[PDB]
Amino acid sequence: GIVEQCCTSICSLYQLENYCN
Amino acid sequence: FVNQALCGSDLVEALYLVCGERGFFYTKPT
């Protein structure tokens, strides 16, 4: 579920940074 | 760019850009 969160629902690039290593 | 959806490369492309130098954990079995 790393994409499903920023993929389906809307994601903020700042919240998308929580997927990095 | 705004709060748009993040699927396909748009995701990695947003991850690759937000961090990139920090790599990420985008996974998917195929």
From Swiss-Prot, chain A:
Superkingdom of the source species: Eukaryota
Annotated disulfide bonds: 6-11
Positions spanned in the full protein: 90 to 110 of 110
Lineage: Eukaryota, Metazoa, Chordata, Craniata, Vertebrata
Ranges in a coiled coil: none
Protein name (record): Insulin A chain
Annotated source species: Homo sapiens
